[PDB]
């Protein structure tokens, strides 16, 4: 089994800083581990539980693997988690001022016994603190950085762009780069940085690694790199949608001309499946109106709206029924096209089929439940439309159904 001393018998969360030091000394003796400095883990039991095995490994390369697994054994035996926040820190870390971040450091040292960290170690506001990675926390404070990061993640669980800098960072000029440093300085309450430190253009700036940012500006470097990466994620998402709306317009014309191969190519690259023109037409509208049966089926597979209405109120079923494309009607009906859809003038698909004398479509519409008694704004049923046209064949089938 596992045997523990009396002074360490208590649960690890309640351990004092001295208890944690005695645990390392006891661990080294019991397991013949390489001698460990008492200062390697200057924290209480509550802070120790926050550490991941990675942090244990980094603090002690030789015995960090064993110490973590040994601590995990103790934790299993007993059957950090609850943190009390002061009023000034009850605000969400996003809204924290730079003074709030300094107070958070002071409270963390009191709550978890930690080596004193200067307020200038994290000279930034709450927004910048969230950007920093765990490695940045360790670099700024080796003794307490990892604990602070894990503490911040627990609190969390429990980008405005200036117009002149709206453009992509690749095209940033030398003057634009300096303004980005200034705007970031006031936005994140960073320490002011000289323009000479980053004497380069936007395309030159992108080459730099994260270490280059920390070398040129120790105080604000890591924030600036993480900020630049967030912009690129924003721009990539921004430009990806602007390219999709332009490919959607190409899909509208490609679905109008019957370009089967080009439609699949545009769809594969992210063209909008439900793109709309000025008249309100979608790629499914135009393909159905012009009888491109093959294109209609691929659009349905990619998620095009079968019952979408344009500005006039005409659904794809209306266009397919009016132009006499019987095959497309059956496919649309299968994908749950509305048989009784009304356009602005009150014409159901049955009305349009009767208006242009497509007898085969009329039978299919009546079979799928199209309303015979439905009336348009002129108070005319589909049967009435056929009488004026003179289509005796269509009229006879309608006349039978009262």
Residue numbers in the entry: 1 to 79, 84 to 162, 172 to 415
Give sentences copied directly from the paper behind this entry.
(i) The long TELSAM polymers are expected to confer increased avidity to any weak crystal contacts made by fused target proteins, allowing crystallization of a greater fraction of proteins. (ii) The regular spacing of target proteins along the sixfold helical TELSAM polymer is expected to pre-programme much of the symmetry and spacing of the resulting crystal lattice.
We chose a DARPin orientation that would allow it to non-covalently bind a second target protein using the DARPin's canonical binding surface while minimizing clashes between that second target protein and the TELSAM polymer. Thin plate crystals appeared in 3 days under various conditions, diffracting to around 3.2 Å resolution. All inter-layer contacts occur solely between DARPins from adjacent polymer layers. Tyr 369 appears to stabilize the position of Lys 368. Since this is a DARPin–DARPin contact, each DARPin makes two such contacts to other DARPins from the adjacent polymer layer. The weak inter-DARPin crystal contacts and vertical displacement of polymer layers may also explain the observed diffraction limits, growth defect and scale factor of the thin/short axis of the crystal.
